[PDB]
Ligand binder design. Structure first.
Ligand SMILES: *[C@@H]1O[C@H](CO)[C@@H](O[C@@H]2O[C@H](CO)[C@@H](O[C@@H]3O[C@H](CO[C@H]4O[C@H](CO)[C@@H](O)[C@H](O)[C@@H]4O)[C@@H](O)[C@H](O[C@H]4O[C@H](CO)[C@@H](O)[C@H](O)[C@@H]4O)[C@@H]3O)[C@H](O)[C@H]2NC(C)=O)[C@H](O)[C@H]1NC(C)=O
Ligand SMILES: *[C@@H]1O[C@H](CO[C@@H]2O[C@@H](C)[C@@H](O)[C@@H](O)[C@@H]2O)[C@@H](O[C@@H]2O[C@H](CO)[C@@H](O)[C@H](O)[C@H]2NC(C)=O)[C@H](O)[C@H]1NC(C)=O
Ligand SMILES: *[C@@H]1O[C@H](CO)[C@@H](O[C@@H]2O[C@H](CO)[C@@H](O)[C@H](O)[C@H]2NC(C)=O)[C@H](O)[C@H]1NC(C)=O
Ligand code: ZN
Ligand code: ZN
Length: 412
């Protein structure tokens, strides 16, 4: 049994300050007054350094010798572009990179850029640029020569897992190329040729007897905290689905972030068979989202470990840990705790596709399992009851990555 951490959406707010002025605590809160801010963060703000530092040392306490770490990006705060230029973006990515290197000096890390890890935000080019070049330098100890060259061109690459994993590979995507707010890739069918490359990597994996973990920042499909919100342009969503449908037999897991909330996505083939699952890990940042229509969309800080079979990459379990921010802020030191173990929460034997399908069916049919999933969705921040419209928004997002079937499901 191996273990790996998955962390995402740290979103440092460099200017977080415990201030007597509620409008000068954190620029990431915008114009929202931040009353009696605490040292470990605030639900209206992105993460203070103290919180990010606490999260890394919590990971070290829980599992100091993981087989590897997956890090799916989003390092900078939710502020206007004019507040956050290229030098600051790169300095922030470097500071977080250095913290991970300091706390886990002997650990391989597979890192993807998130949509905020660029200036201007979301405008990821399908070609080389100063940010891809400098991040390749920061992540060079983690990249093969081939991956270093690929990263400079498109911020995507693939790496063979080291032993004792028998025959595994991690594929790291730049899914920021597909975000509808990214004007750099408007009108491009296959920006950076990433889909062509991905298919080729996965065909090679089948030839070579390897199983693959696919990671990225922005997921396909819809955001479960609202209705009708997809990040990918429709054509990219369709292409991503086509890749999974063709190559699922070599894909042992998909690991994404961006939402900051804890959910998962099922993939099915045209016979109705479940063929893959994507795990959307929560964020370290607690920041209450400004996405229109989302009420009280904050979360507790979360981190996650997966347990896996080193011989096959089959996922055996996951454990999500959290910091109860409201409690931590009245205490001298933040102490992270176990939120849940997946097999226990859903009463399933492992984290296989069949087990996740069972989890969904229970979420969709048993009130107490729906509510359990819902509480965990915000990392145990919000305990109000998930009522009928909440249920449909979550169930449809989990079940339907495709635009048209998601739309039909929402009619329920
Ligand atoms: C699916 O699987 C296939 C294998 O079946 C992969 O194909 C291999 O891809 C690699 C990577 O591109 C190829 O290796 C590269 O070969 C280049 C050419 O090498 C010859 O020719 C040059 C000039 O003619 C000579 O200089 C050289 O000595 C050889 O005679 C090299 O230029 C490449 O160098 C790269 O890596 C090193 C660092 O390790 C750097 O020094 C270079 O700057 C450069 O970064 C590299 O060695 C290999 O030839 C391919 N094999 C076959 C059989 O085709 C596919 O890539 C894979 N598909 C995907 C999508 O992953
Ligand atoms: C955070 O505040 C900085 C300004 O802080 C000063 O510069 C830092 C480098 C550091 O030395 C602090 O102690 C200083 O008080 C903002 O940076 C400025 O932003 C304005 C635009 O509003 C721009 O005109 C200035 O040139 C910027 N200064 C520098 C040095 O770049 C920064 O935008 C704030 N960060 C966030 C994320 O909101
Ligand atoms: C980052 O977090 C670590 C872990 O909590 C902090 O290190 C602790 O610091 C206290 C006070 O100096 C010591 O009593 C502990 O022994 C330290 N623990 C470890 C494991 O080193 C560290 O101070 C934090 N750094 C920042 C910049 O906040
Ligand atoms: Zn994020
Ligand atoms: Zn994001």
């Amino acid at each position: 049994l191996g273990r790996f951490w998955h962390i995402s959406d740290l979103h440092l707010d460099p200017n977080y300050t415990v201030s007597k002025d509620p409008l000068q605590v954190c620029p990431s809160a915008g114009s929202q007054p931040v009353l009696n801010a605490g040292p470990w963060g605030d639900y209206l703000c992105d993460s203070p350094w103290a919180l990010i530092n606490s999260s890394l040392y919590a990971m070290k306490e829980i599992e100091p010798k993981p087989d590897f770490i997956l890090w799916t990006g989003d390092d900078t705060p939710h502020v206007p572009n004019e507040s956050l230029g290229e030098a600051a973006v790169l300095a922030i990515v470097e500071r977080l990179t250095n913290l991970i290197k300091e706390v886990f000096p002997d650990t391989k890390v597979y890192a993807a850029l998130g949509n905020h890890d660029f200036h201007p935000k979301n405008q990821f080019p399908a070609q080389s640029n100063r940010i891809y070049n400098q991040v390749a330098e920061l992540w060079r100890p983690w990249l093969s020569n081939e991956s270093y060259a690929l990263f400079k061109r498109g911020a995507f690459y693939s790496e063979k897992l080291p032993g004792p994993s028998r025959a595994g590979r991690v594929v790291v995507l730049n899914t920021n190329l597909y975000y509808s707010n990214n004007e750099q890739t408007a009108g491009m069918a296959d920006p950076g040729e990433q889909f062509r490359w991905l298919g080729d990597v996965l065909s090679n994996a089948s030839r070579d007897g390897e199983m693959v973990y696919v990671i990225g920042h922005v997921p396909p499909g819809f955001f479960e905290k609202t209705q009708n919100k997809a990040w990918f342009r429709e054509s990219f969503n369709e292409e991503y689905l086509k890749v999974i449908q063709k190559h699922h037999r070599v894909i042992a897991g998909q690991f994404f972030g961006h939402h900051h909330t804890d959910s998962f996505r099922m993939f099915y083939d045209n016979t109705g068979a479940p063929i893959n699952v994507m795990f959307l890990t929560p964020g370290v940042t607690p920041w209450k989202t400004t996405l229109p229509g989302v009420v009280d969309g904050a979360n507790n800080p979360g981190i996650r470990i997966f347990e896996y079979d080193r011989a096959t990459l089959n996922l055996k379990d996951l454990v999500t840990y959290f910091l109860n921010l409201r409690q931590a802020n009245v205490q001298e030191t933040p102490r992270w705790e176990q939120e849940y173990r997946l097999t226990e929460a859903y009463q399933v034997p492992d984290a296989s596709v069949s087990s996740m399908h069972t989890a969904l069916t229970r979420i969709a049919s048993e009130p107490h399992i729906l509510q359990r999933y819902y509480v965990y969705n915000s990392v145990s921040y919000n305990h109000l009851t998930c009522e009928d419209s909440c249920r449909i928004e979550h169930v449809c997002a989990i079940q339907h990555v495709a635009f048209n079937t998601y739309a039909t499901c929402l009619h329920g």
